[PDB]
Design an enzyme around this catalytic site. Sequence first.
Site, PDB file in Angstrom:
ATOM      1  N   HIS A  90      -1.468  -2.170   0.286  1.00 17.00           N
ATOM      2  CA  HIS A  90      -1.331  -0.716   0.349  1.00 17.00           C
ATOM      3  C   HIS A  90      -2.367  -0.003  -0.537  1.00 17.00           C
ATOM      4  CE1 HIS A  90       1.495   2.971   0.652  1.00 17.00           C
ATOM      5  NE2 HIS A  90       0.699   3.320  -0.374  1.00 17.00           N
ATOM      6  N   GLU A  91      -2.619  -0.479  -1.751  1.00 16.74           N
ATOM      7  CA  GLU A  91      -3.558   0.198  -2.644  1.00 16.74           C
ATOM      8  C   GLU A  91      -5.018  -0.003  -2.252  1.00 16.74           C
ATOM      9  OE1 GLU A  91      -2.342   2.504  -4.451  1.00 16.74           O
ATOM     10  OE2 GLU A  91      -0.321   1.734  -4.105  1.00 16.74           O
ATOM     11  N   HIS A  94      -5.979   2.366   0.371  1.00 18.01           N
ATOM     12  CA  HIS A  94      -6.390   3.664  -0.147  1.00 18.01           C
ATOM     13  C   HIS A  94      -7.858   3.639  -0.548  1.00 18.01           C
ATOM     14  CE1 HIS A  94      -2.542   5.775  -0.044  1.00 18.01           C
ATOM     15  NE2 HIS A  94      -1.931   4.946  -0.911  1.00 18.01           N
ATOM     16  N   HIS A 100      -1.876   7.964   3.358  1.00 21.64           N
ATOM     17  CA  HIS A 100      -0.576   7.533   3.859  1.00 21.64           C
ATOM     18  C   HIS A 100      -0.346   7.929   5.309  1.00 21.64           C
ATOM     19  CE1 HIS A 100       0.358   7.790  -0.620  1.00 21.64           C
ATOM     20  NE2 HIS A 100       0.564   6.503  -0.293  1.00 21.64           N
ATOM     21  N   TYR A 149       5.752   5.445   3.950  1.00 22.74           N
ATOM     22  CA  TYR A 149       6.828   5.301   2.963  1.00 22.74           C
ATOM     23  C   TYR A 149       8.177   4.952   3.588  1.00 22.74           C
ATOM     24  CZ  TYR A 149       4.386   6.794  -1.414  1.00 22.74           C
ATOM     25  OH  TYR A 149       3.630   6.828  -2.538  1.00 22.74           O
TER      26      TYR A 149
HETATM   27  O1  M6X Z   1       3.185   5.235  -3.676  1.00 25.73           O
HETATM   28  C1  M6X Z   1       2.863   4.330  -4.448  1.00 25.73           C
HETATM   29  C2  M6X Z   1       3.898   3.444  -5.101  1.00 25.73           C
HETATM   30  C3  M6X Z   1       3.795   1.984  -4.695  1.00 25.73           C
HETATM   31  N1  M6X Z   1       4.673   1.575  -3.554  1.00 25.73           N
HETATM   32  C4  M6X Z   1       4.303   2.199  -2.275  1.00 25.73           C
HETATM   33  C5  M6X Z   1       4.403   1.242  -1.113  1.00 25.73           C
HETATM   34  C6  M6X Z   1       4.041  -0.082  -1.260  1.00 25.73           C
HETATM   35  C7  M6X Z   1       4.115  -0.998  -0.208  1.00 25.73           C
HETATM   36  C8  M6X Z   1       4.578  -0.521   0.979  1.00 25.73           C
HETATM   37  C9  M6X Z   1       4.951   0.795   1.139  1.00 25.73           C
HETATM   38  C10 M6X Z   1       4.879   1.700   0.120  1.00 25.73           C
HETATM   39  O2  M6X Z   1       5.378   0.999   2.430  1.00 25.73           O
HETATM   40  C11 M6X Z   1       4.958  -0.169   3.133  1.00 25.73           C
HETATM   41  O3  M6X Z   1       4.756  -1.196   2.163  1.00 25.73           O
HETATM   42  C12 M6X Z   1       6.123   1.658  -3.805  1.00 25.73           C
HETATM   43  C13 M6X Z   1       6.560   0.960  -5.070  1.00 25.73           C
HETATM   44  C14 M6X Z   1       6.904  -0.377  -5.047  1.00 25.73           C
HETATM   45  C15 M6X Z   1       7.312  -1.065  -6.192  1.00 25.73           C
HETATM   46  C16 M6X Z   1       7.355  -0.345  -7.346  1.00 25.73           C
HETATM   47  C17 M6X Z   1       7.020   0.987  -7.385  1.00 25.73           C
HETATM   48  C18 M6X Z   1       6.624   1.672  -6.271  1.00 25.73           C
HETATM   49  O4  M6X Z   1       7.153   1.456  -8.673  1.00 25.73           O
HETATM   50  C19 M6X Z   1       7.233   0.272  -9.463  1.00 25.73           C
HETATM   51  O5  M6X Z   1       7.714  -0.764  -8.606  1.00 25.73           O
HETATM   52  N2  M6X Z   1       1.621   4.077  -4.780  1.00 25.73           N
HETATM   53  O6  M6X Z   1       0.620   4.068  -3.819  1.00 25.73           O
HETATM   54 ZN    ZN Z   2       0.038   4.941  -0.995  1.00 27.20          ZN
END
Ligand code: M6X
Ligand code: ZN
Lengths: 532, 535
Positions: A90-91, A94, A100, A149
Site C-alpha cells: 500500500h505505501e 503511494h 487511495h 480503506y
Molecule cells: O492509511 C494509512 C494507514 C495504514 N493502513 C492502511 C491500509 C493498509 C493496507 C491495506 C489497506 C489500508 O486496505 C487494503 O490493505 C492501515 C493500518 C494498518 C495497521 C496499522 C495502522 C494502520 O496503524 C498502525 O497499525 N497509511 O497509508
Molecule cells: Zn494509503
Amino acid sequence: NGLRDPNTRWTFPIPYILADNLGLNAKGAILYAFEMFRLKSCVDFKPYEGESSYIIFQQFDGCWSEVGDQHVGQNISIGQGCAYKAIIEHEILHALGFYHEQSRTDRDDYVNIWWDQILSGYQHNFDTYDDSLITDLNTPYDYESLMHYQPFSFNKNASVPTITAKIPEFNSIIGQRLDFSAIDLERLNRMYNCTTTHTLLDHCTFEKANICGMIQGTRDDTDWAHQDSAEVDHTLLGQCTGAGYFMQFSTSSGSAEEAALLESRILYPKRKQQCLQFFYKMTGSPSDRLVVWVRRDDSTGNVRKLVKVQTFQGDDDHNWKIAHVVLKEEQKFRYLFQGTKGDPQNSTGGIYLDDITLTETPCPTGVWTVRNFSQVLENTSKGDKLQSPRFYNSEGYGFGVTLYPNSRESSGYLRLAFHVCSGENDAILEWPVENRQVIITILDQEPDVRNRMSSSMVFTTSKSHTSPAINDTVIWDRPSRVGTYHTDCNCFRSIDLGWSGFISHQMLKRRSFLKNDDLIIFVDFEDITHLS
Amino acid sequence: NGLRDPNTRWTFPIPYILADNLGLNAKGAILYAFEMFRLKSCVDFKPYEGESSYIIFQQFDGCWSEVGDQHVGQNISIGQGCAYKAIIEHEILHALGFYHEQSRTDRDDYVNIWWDQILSGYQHNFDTYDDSLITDLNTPYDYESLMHYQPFSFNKNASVPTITAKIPEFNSIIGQRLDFSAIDLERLNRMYNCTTTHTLLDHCTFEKANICGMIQGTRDDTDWAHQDSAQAGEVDHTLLGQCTGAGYFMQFSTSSGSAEEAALLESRILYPKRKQQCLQFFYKMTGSPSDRLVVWVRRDDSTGNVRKLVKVQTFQGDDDHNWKIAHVVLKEEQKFRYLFQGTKGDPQNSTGGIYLDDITLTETPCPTGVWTVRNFSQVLENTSKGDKLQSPRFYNSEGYGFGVTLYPNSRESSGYLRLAFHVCSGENDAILEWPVENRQVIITILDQEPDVRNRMSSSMVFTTSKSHTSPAINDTVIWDRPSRVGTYHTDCNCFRSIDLGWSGFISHQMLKRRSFLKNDDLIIFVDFEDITHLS
Ligand SMILES: O=C(CCN(Cc1ccc2c(c1)OCO2)Cc1ccc2c(c1)OCO2)NO
Ligand SMILES: [Zn+2]
Ligand SMILES: *[C@@H]1O[C@H](CO[C@@H]2O[C@@H](C)[C@@H](O)[C@@H](O)[C@@H]2O)[C@@H](O[C@@H]2O[C@H](CO)[C@@H](O[C@@H]3O[C@H](CO)[C@@H](O)[C@H](O)[C@@H]3O)[C@H](O)[C@H]2NC(C)=O)[C@H](O)[C@H]1NC(C)=O
Ligand SMILES: *[C@@H]1O[C@H](CO[C@@H]2O[C@@H](C)[C@@H](O)[C@@H](O)[C@@H]2O)[C@@H](O[C@@H]2O[C@H](CO)[C@@H](O[C@@H]3O[C@H](CO)[C@@H](O)[C@H](O)[C@@H]3O)[C@H](O)[C@H]2NC(C)=O)[C@H](O)[C@H]1NC(C)=O
Ligand SMILES: *[C@@H]1O[C@H](CO)[C@@H](O[C@@H]2O[C@H](CO)[C@@H](O[C@@H]3O[C@H](CO)[C@@H](O)[C@H](O)[C@H]3NC(C)=O)[C@H](O)[C@H]2NC(C)=O)[C@H](O)[C@H]1NC(C)=O
Ligand SMILES: *[C@@H]1O[C@H](CO)[C@@H](O[C@@H]2O[C@H](CO)[C@@H](O)[C@H](O)[C@H]2NC(C)=O)[C@H](O)[C@H]1NC(C)=O
Ligand SMILES: *[C@@H]1O[C@H](CO)[C@@H](O[C@@H]2O[C@H](CO)[C@@H](O)[C@H](O)[C@H]2NC(C)=O)[C@H](O)[C@H]1NC(C)=O
Ligand SMILES: *[C@@H]1O[C@H](CO)[C@@H](O[C@@H]2O[C@H](CO)[C@@H](O)[C@H](O)[C@H]2NC(C)=O)[C@H](O)[C@H]1NC(C)=O
Ligand SMILES: *[C@@H]1O[C@H](CO)[C@@H](O[C@@H]2O[C@H](CO)[C@@H](O)[C@H](O)[C@H]2NC(C)=O)[C@H](O)[C@H]1NC(C)=O
Ligand SMILES: O=C(CCN(Cc1ccc2c(c1)OCO2)Cc1ccc2c(c1)OCO2)NO
Ligand SMILES: *[C@@H]1O[C@H](CO)[C@@H](O)[C@H](O)[C@H]1NC(C)=O
Ligand SMILES: *[C@@H]1O[C@H](CO)[C@@H](O)[C@H](O)[C@H]1NC(C)=O
Ligand SMILES: [Ca+2]
Ligand SMILES: [Ca+2]
Ligand SMILES: [Ca+2]
Ligand SMILES: [Ca+2]
Ligand SMILES: [Zn+2]
C-alpha cells in the site's frame, strides 16, 4: 487513481534506504514486499548509490507516504504493527504515484464517506482530487483494491463505519489486506508500461494447442497423453468436458521400467535459483516413479546435458498433490518430467500433471496440506487443534504449525501459530532461536502468479517472546526443556505463536484458498540477522 | 635438467590452443593434466585470446615438445597412444623448460646409455647438456622422475635395454608413469617461485597438538579427544602403529552418557578460490548402529560473519570397524568452516565410537565412484589367474550406471593387475542416449597420502567410442544399452556390459610400494563424464 503528471514517475530501479530505526522484522518484511513487485510487475528496487531521488523507509508513527517521485528523496513510514506485506505494498503504491481508491474523482457514485465520524487529523485520506491532478487509467472503481480503506478506518466509534459502499454487499470486500488486486497491477502496468515481470519464468495449465511449448523426446519408450477431462484436471476440477486439460501417463499396461519424457520449452534464467511448483497424482503401483530432470546448455549453446533433480512415489492418497522442486540453473535449460512404469500387473492407474509454475524465487521451506477442510471446519470445536508434520529449515531447526479451524479468541476466524519442534540437530544449534523470520502464507491455487492474492503474515523470533507457562523463560528456547511431548512425531513442540484472526471463514471460501476442498499452507523459517 | 636462461621462462597463465586434429579423448586428457598442475603447483593455463607466445597442442607423429618458451608460439604433439596424464605432464614439463633426467650433466654417475641399441632419429633424447645450458636447481638425480626414460626406450631389440641404472635395484624403478615425483615438483617450484597451489585448500593429519587450527565449541554437549595411538587394538590411519609416540587421530566415544549427546569439531576459516570443493577424510565407527557422524558447513552470512549453518552429509556404522574413506561435495563461494558432529546413539549398546584422521580439502569435483578392496595381499594370493572381482554399481551426474572389474592376477600380463570399466544397467536407462558416444572414463588407484603434493596416484584415461565393438555381441557397440549387450548378475541385479580396460594397469611390485596398500586395502577412484562440449 494515478497522479496525471508524466514528470512525477520513477525511472527503475527505485533506489532505497532502510533506516536503522526499523526493526529486523520490518527490514525483512520490506525486502519480502519488494519480491512481490518483482514477481507481478517490472518495478524493481536497488540500494541507494548517490541518486537524486530515492525512498527512505523509517519507523515513524503510523503508515504513510508521499505520492509520486518527489525528486529530492522521500519517506515511507512503517510504524508498529505496519510491518506487513500488504501494508508496505500500500505505501510503495503511494510513492509510485497512486492515491487511495476512495480518492478517485468519480468515487461518490460508489461509496459513502461519513464525514462526522473520521478522527481529527486524518480527513485528507478521504479527500478527492480533481481530474487535472488524477487519471482513471481507463479502469473502473475496484472495491478489492489494496488502495481502498476498510469500513472501520480512523473511526470515532468502533461500532460505526467511516466508509461504506452504496450497495451494502461490498462492505465485506472493501479494504482487503491480502495482496495486489488484478486492477491494481493493471493500473501499475498502465502507468509504467510493464507487461513482463522480473521473476515469473514459466507457467502451464496445459490449455494451449502447443501445450505451452512443451515437447516429447524420441529417446524414451512412450509418450505422455494430453487428456480431455471427459477423472478431472487441476485447473478447473472438471467444470466442463474439454475445458480443463492435463498430462496423463498410464502405468496399467506394458513392461516394468518403460518411460516417457515431457520436456519444457528452452528457458533463459535471470537468477541462480528457481522453484518449480506443480500438481500431480500417482494412482498406479507403489513402484512407479515421477522423476524431475533438467536438460541444460553444455556451454557450447547446445541444450543436451541431463541432471536428475527429484523423485516422487505413490502412497495411498490418490488425490492431487502439490510438489516443489528446487532448480539451480544459470544457463538456458529445459525442465523434464519422466514417468516410469513399475509393476504394471499391480497398477490400475498412472501419473498425472497439471498447473505447473516456475519462478526465480526460493521454494517454501515447509508445505502443509489439510484435506477436506470445509468438513474439518464443521467437525472441529472452538479451540481444538491440528498440528503439522515436523519441518527442517536450511540451518537444521525443526519447526511446525498449529492450526485451530475455529478460533475461540475470534469467532468466524482461523488461527495459525508457529512452533519449534525438537529435531536431530538440536544438540548443536544456538538457543533460543531468535532473529529468524517466520513467513506463513496460505496459497491462492491460481496457476498464474499475476492472478494470485495469497494471504501472508510475518513475525521475527525475539528474546521478548516469553510465557508464564514456562516460568517467564523464552518461548524459542530448546524444545526438550520449554516444550511438551507428542506421539504423532516423537517431538517436543514449543509454545505456539502467531495470529488469532489470521483469515476469516468468509474470506477462505473465496479466491481459491480451498480449490479441491483442501487448504495449502507455506512456511518459511529463515535467519535475518544479516539485515542488522 | 632445467634450462638456465631466465628469458626461456613463461608468464602465467600460459595461453593454449587445443587444435581440432586432437580427438576428444586427447583434448579431455590435456584439460585433466592442467588440473593436476593447478593442484600440485602454481602453474596455470588460459584459452588463447591473441597473445604473442602460446602452446598449440596438435596430433602429429609421435609425442614431443620444444623446451622452454619459444616467443612466437610452439607445438606440443600428442599422438596416438599418448592420451595419458603422465605423458601429457611430461610434454608440458618440456615446454616449461625441463630436459629428460638422463640428460643431466652428472647423469653418467647414475646411468649407462647403450647408444648402439637406440633406433635411428631418437638419439637426441639421450644427449647430456652442459652446466652453462642447464641447472640442477640444487637437486639430486631422481630415478623416480617423470622425466626419466624406462630401460626399454627406443630399443632396436625388445630383450635389450637402451638405459640401465648403475645400481641394478633402480632398473625396476626408472621410467615410472604415475605422476610428478617429489623432486620434480621441487624443481618446478624453484624454477617458477611457486609456494601455494591453485586448488589445495586445506589438509589435516592431526599430528600437532594445534590440530591444524581446529576448534571445539561449547554449544554442543562434549568434546572430541585428541588420541595418542598408544592403546592396544586401536591406532591412527596416518602411521598405523609404525612409529612410537607419533600418530594422532580425533576420537569421540559413544559407550557412556545419554543418547543424542554430541561434539562439534570445527575448521579454521577458509577462502575458496572456486565454486566447488571436495572434502576427503578417513573414519571408523566402532560404536552403536545409531551413532552419526555428520558433516556441516558454517558460512559467511553476507555481513562478513561466518555464522550460517548448512548440513552437507551423514555417515553411520555397519559391521566393518576398519578405516573407511569418505568424500563430501561442498559448494562454497564465500568464506566458510567445515564441521564434524559426532552423535551418541544407544550408549548401553556401544563399546566404541567415532574416529577421524587424514582430512584433505581441494577445489575439485569429488570422484564419481570409489571402491575399497579389503585384505588385498591375501586376495592377491588366494585368487587364481583370470578370476575377477567386481565393484558395486555407481551412478554419474547424468544418471548412467557404471562399475569396474578387477582381475588381481592378470592372465594376459603375468605380475600385473588388470583393471577395466563397464556400464551397468540402472534406473534411468530408458531415457538416456545409447550407445555412449563421447564419455571420458578416468580410473585412478589412490596413493594414500593426505597431502596431495606427496601422492603419485596411478591413472588411466579413455573415451567411450562407436569403434569399441566385440565378436561376443555380433560386432555391435560395447557401450549400447546394458540389457541388450550385457550379462545378468545376482550380485547387484544389474546387467553389466563387456568391460574395456588395461591388462598391465599396474605391476604387483609397484603396488607393494608407496601408499597404494596402506592398511592392506586398495582404493580405486572412477569418473565417467561427457566431453562432447570440447568438440
Ligand atoms: O492509511 C494509512 C494507514 C495504514 N493502513 C492502511 C491500509 C493498509 C493496507 C491495506 C489497506 C489500508 O486496505 C487494503 O490493505 C492501515 C493500518 C494498518 C495497521 C496499522 C495502522 C494502520 O496503524 C498502525 O497499525 N497509511 O497509508
Ligand atoms: Zn494509503
Ligand atoms: C500392489 O499395490 C498395492 C497398492 O496399490 C493399490 O492397489 C492396487 C491393487 C492397484 O489398484 C493400485 O493402482 C493401487 O494404487 C500395495 O498395497 C499396499 O501395500 C503397502 C505395504 O504393505 C501398504 O502400506 C501399509 O499399510 C498398512 C495399513 O494398511 C500400514 O500399517 C503399514 O505401515 C503400511 O503403510 C498399503 O496400505 C497398501 N495399499 C493398498 C491400497 O492396499 C501392494 O503391496 C502391492 N503388491 C505388490 C505385489 O507389490
Ligand atoms: C546393538 O549393536 C549391535 C552392533 O553393535 C556392536 O555390538 C554392540 C554390543 C557393541 O559392542 C558395539 O560397539 C558393536 O559395534 C547390533 O547388531 C547388529 O545388528 C544389525 C542389524 O540387525 C545386523 O545387521 C544385519 O546382519 C544380518 C546378518 O547377520 C543381515 O542379514 C541383515 O541384512 C543386517 O545386515 C548386524 O549383523 C548385527 N551385528 C552384530 C555384531 O551382531 C544390534 O542390533 C544392536 N542392538 C540394539 C539394541 O540396537
Ligand atoms: C623467481 O624470482 C627470481 C628472483 O628472486 C627471478 O630471478 C630473476 O630473474 C630476472 C629476470 O626475470 C633477472 O633479471 C635479469 O638479470 C639479468 C642478469 O642476471 C639481466 O641481464 C636482465 O636484464 C635482467 N632482466 C630484468 C627483467 O630485470 C634477475 O637477475 C633474477 N634474479 C635472481 C636472484 O636470479 C626468477 O626469474 C623468478 N622465476 C619465475 C619465473 O618466477
Ligand atoms: C524524512 O523526514 C525527515 C524528518 O522526519 C526529514 O529530515 C529533515 O529534513 C529537513 C530538510 O533537509 C531538515 O531541515 C530537518 O532537520 C530534518 N529533520 C530530521 C529529524 O532529520 C527527511 O529529509 C525526510 N526525507 C526526505 C529525503 O524527504
Ligand atoms: C457508539 O455508538 C453506539 C451505537 O449508537 C452507542 O451505543 C448507544 O448508547 C446510547 C447512549 O449513549 C444508548 O442509548 C443506545 O441504546 C446505545 N445503542 C447501542 C446499539 O448500544 C455508544 O454509546 C457509542 N459510543 C461512543 C464512544 O460514543
Ligand atoms: C607447428 O605446426 C604447424 C602446423 O603443422 C606448422 O605450420 C606449418 O607447418 C608446415 C609443416 O612444417 C609448414 O610447411 C608450414 O609452412 C607451416 N605454416 C606456418 C608457418 O604456419 C608450424 O610451422 C609448426 N611450428 C611452430 C612451432 O609453430
Ligand atoms: C635380440 O637379442 C637376442 C639376444 O642376443 C637375440 O637372440 C639370439 O639370437 C641369436 C641368433 O641371431 C642366437 O644365436 C642366440 O642364441 C640368441 N640368444 C638368446 C638369448 O636368445 C635375438 O635374435 C635378437 N633379436 C633381434 C631383433 O635381433
Ligand atoms: O620421448 C618422448 C616420447 C614420449 N614418452 C616419453 C615418456 C613419457 C612419460 C614418462 C616417461 C617417458 O618416463 C616417465 O614417464 C614415451 C612414449 C609413450 C607412449 C608412446 C610413445 C612414446 O610413442 C607412442 O606411444 N617424447 O618426449
Ligand atoms: C474426504 O472425504 C471423502 C468423501 O467425500 C472421503 O472418501 C475421503 O477419505 C476424505 N479424506 C480425508 C483425508 O478425510
Ligand atoms: C580381512 O581379514 C580379517 C581377518 O584377518 C577379517 O576379520 C576381515 O573381515 C577381512 N576383511 C575383508 C572383508 O576382506
Ligand atoms: Ca489444466
Ligand atoms: Ca516419447
Ligand atoms: Ca564441545
Ligand atoms: Ca593422524
Ligand atoms: Zn621427453
